RNA sequence: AAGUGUACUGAGUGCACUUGGAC
RNA sequence: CCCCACUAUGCUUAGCCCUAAACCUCAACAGUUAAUCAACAAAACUGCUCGCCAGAACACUACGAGCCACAGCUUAAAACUCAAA
């Protein structure tokens, strides 16, 4: 019931349609719409669902905290300024 | 007794809580140029807040308004409104 | 001008043309990419069918259908009918994620068919027919 | 009449200054490796910067230099860590040499 | 077995799939990563997909380091969308047996 | 209590529209509202097609009756609106400014996350 | 993958639930 | 086990049945961080109250009883066996 055209919709710069089809799916992906289509395609039961978005969630964290600690610990690499002890 | 003991009082120094740029500001669900600005240009997918950089109260309105201006008939739902593309981009997004 | 990759807006004074007319002018083909066929349509504005083509048409039987191949073909031979109609821009709309995705596109351009516009129109159910079961192998 | 150190302490520069972000000090260089200038400013622990790109020359051990401090300590708590890990050395900006 | 060859079947189908948008990373995405098949061990402890290597040895070795990095996450999506219940973990593993046709046919040109 | 009506009409004639919105009055005021005030937000395109009574439309009338009425009147407010036909679209909410605007004084810090590990020696 | 409840069928399946599993 | 179609059923109303890994497997309330503690798990405890357990299997069983309105649930044993579980 929405206007057509004006969802999803990229215009090709210069006919190079291969790089406008990536920024579309690029936007896709970005937005989830890909996720969404790939899981629906089979129903998730709700306590699959459940314990799959906690997994997520707790994989999200640790791999921020661990990215953190790692460019934290990251300037440490220079080269040792005390050589020879 | 002696007038160099440290006192008892609250930081000075601290400075005040970064207000989110809503904070303050009376979210309406009629301000349909206000949500398009919190919301997907390609698909209308209300985007969360580690991207809105709002607090969790403001957050929650916005998604409010959003949902009641969709159902009302005041906003599109699948795409944010072509009126509104021209507004401040708010929302830390790097499509490009 | 700077380019600009959102649509035109319909009922709007735009100066972008094609061979004179008008985006909202520009004929439209569609193209169904599900997982086991691929689809093109070339309608008119008025959504007149113009050219059709699928991987059934062309021949292409049983698992052959979802190839690159072949939905190069579907396209080529959907370009050339469009042709003959003649057509010459199209805005191209795709739905289903079906392997001749970007190769129905490929085989339109390659049978000449100036695409304009890469649009997508994906069925995306907000919430409604329960899904069926998962398959096990 | 001798200070006591509750007075040495409120009379302290460092004290004197405040939080220690983006505040201007003028540090010292007292040890350089190669490219990295080990800075100290009277803080508890120095700051490595790192030989600018311009008048890398005049870098030179006691070099008075210009440091914008960020943190006399940088520390961070990790995931489940009971402490504060520490990397023994401030965060600070080299802005150039002072004159 | 014919189940381990439906297996590879619908795995390769999965993988290519999964492979065709930025899911996984935008930059594995860009690489535009090619599988020539998936095959997997007799006991089901590992599936090894088999993609097509470029020209290039530089790109060859990103390719291969951000296919190492994403086969986890690649595993976890599979899982996630019930395309196998169970999935052993992904090994990548570099395909050239093309090379031998492509310089066969410089030669005999 | 002030109640705050969404009205988007059927794109039409002026002489029509005043009769429209003084029917719509008149059937407020007969289950008993204390009319406040009445805006128009003016005509425009509806952002997606709406259907009503055997028609669709795509542009439409927006109006704003704010009012008061007892809690009762509503349903039948509701009843009415929906059996008219000139109407492409009624809703009726509790009037925003009757919520009052409390004050937050910002974001407030976010602490590591809220022990989603264990504590435990491990 | 395992199991709880429940129902059909003759060990599986259906619905929900738990991780006392993997990512 | 895979594919196709389809039924109970998932839905509304009005009534029934009362069981789940009904789980944060960590009872309510108050309090403490003082000296750590089988092991793992969700750091360790104090006070106070109620409920519950006294090896395993026999046994979410039999008998009786209640609810049923007759094919089931709740309550729940005994004998025999073993030095384990
Ligand atoms: S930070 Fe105060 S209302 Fe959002
Ligand atoms: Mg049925």
Redesign the pocket.
């Given at each position: 019931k929405h206007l057509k055209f004006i969802a999803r919709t990229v215009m090709v710069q210069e006919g190079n349609v291969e790089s406008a089809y990536r920024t579309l799916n690029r936007i896709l992906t970005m937005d989830g719409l890909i996720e969404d289509i790939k899981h629906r395609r089979y129903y998730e039961?709700?306590?699959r669902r459940?314990?799959r978005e906690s997994?997520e969630r707790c994989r999200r964290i640790y791999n921020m905290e661990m990215a953190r600690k790692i460019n934290f610990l990251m300037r440490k690499n220079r080269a040792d300024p005390w050589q020879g002890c | 007794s002696n007038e160099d003991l440290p006192i008892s009082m609250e930081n000075p120094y601290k400075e005040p809580l970064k207000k989110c740029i809503l904070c303050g500001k009376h979210v309406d669900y009629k301000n349909v140029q206000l949500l398009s600005q919190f919301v997907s240009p390609f698909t209308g997918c209300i985007y969360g807040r580690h991207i809105t950089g709002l607090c969790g109260k403001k957050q929650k309105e916005i998604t409010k308004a959003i949902k009641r201006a969709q159902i009302m008939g005041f906003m599109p739902v699948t795409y944010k409104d072509p009126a509104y593309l021209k507004d401040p981009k708010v929302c830390n997004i790097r499509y490009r | 001008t700077k380019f600009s990759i959102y649509p035109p807006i319909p009922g709007e004074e735009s100066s972008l043309r094609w061979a004179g007319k008008k985006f909202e002018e520009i004929p439209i083909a569609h193209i169904k990419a599900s997982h086991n066929n691929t689809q093109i349509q070339v309608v008119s504005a008025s959504n007149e069918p113009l050219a059709f083509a699928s991987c059934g048409t062309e021949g292409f039987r049983n698992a052959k259908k979802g190839t690159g191949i072949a939905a190069q073909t579907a396209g080529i031979a959907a370009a050339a009918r469009a042709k003959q109609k003649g057509v010459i821009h199209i805005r191209v709309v795709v739905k289903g994620l079906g392997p001749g995705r970007l190769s129905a596109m490929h085989g339109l351009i390659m049978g000449g068919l100036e695409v304009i516009s890469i649009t997508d129109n994906t069925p995306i159910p907000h919430n409604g027919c329960?899904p069926r079961?998962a398959?096990?192998? | 009449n001798v200070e006591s150190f509750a007075s040495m302490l409120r009379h302290s520069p460092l004290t004197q200054m405040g939080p220690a972000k983006d505040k201007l000090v003028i540090g010292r260089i007292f040890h350089i490796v190669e490219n990295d200038l080990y800075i100290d400013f009277g803080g508890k622990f120095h700051c490595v910067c790192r030989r600018p790109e311009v008048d890398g020359e005049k870098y030179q051990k006691g070099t008075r230099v210009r440091l914008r401090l960020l943190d006399l300590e940088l520390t961070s708590r990790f995931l489940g860590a009971t402490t504060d890990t520490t990397v023994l050395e401030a965060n600070a900006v080299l802005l150039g040499i002072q004159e | 077995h014919a189940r381990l060859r439906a297996l590879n079947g619908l795995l390769y189908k999965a993988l290519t799939d999964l492979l065709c948008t930025p899911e996984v990373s935008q930059e594995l995405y860009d690489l535009n990563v090619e599988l020539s098949k998936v095959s997997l061990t007799p006991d089901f402890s590992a599936c090894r997909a088999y993609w097509k290597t470029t020209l290039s040895a530089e790109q060859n070795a990103h390719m291969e380091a951000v296919l190492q990095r994403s086969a986890?996450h690649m595993?976890?999506l599979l899982?996630?969308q019930q395309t196998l219940?169970?999935v052993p973990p992904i090994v990548f593993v570099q395909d050239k047996g093309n090379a031998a046709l492509a310089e066969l046919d410089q030669l005999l040109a | 209590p002030r109640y705050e009506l969404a009205l988007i009409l059927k794109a039409m004639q002026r002489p029509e529209t005043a009769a429209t919105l003084k029917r719509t009055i008149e059937a407020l005021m007969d289950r008993g509202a204390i009319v406040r005030d009445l805006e128009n937000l003016g005509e425009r395109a509806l952002p997606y097609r709406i259907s009503a009574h055997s028609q669709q439309h795509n542009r439409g009338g927006y109006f704003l009756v704010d009012f008061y009425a007892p809690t009762a009147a509503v349903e039948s407010m509701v009843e009415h609106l929906s059996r008219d036909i000139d109407v492409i679209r009624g809703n009726i909410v509790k009037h925003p400014l009757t919520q009052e605007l409390k004050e937050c004084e910002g974001i407030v810090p976010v602490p590591l996350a809220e022990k989603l590990y264990?504590?435990?020696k491990?």
């Open positions: 039961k709700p306590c459940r314990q997994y | - | 329960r079961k398959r096990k192998l | - | 986890a595993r976890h899982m996630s219940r169970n | 264990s504590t435990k491990r």
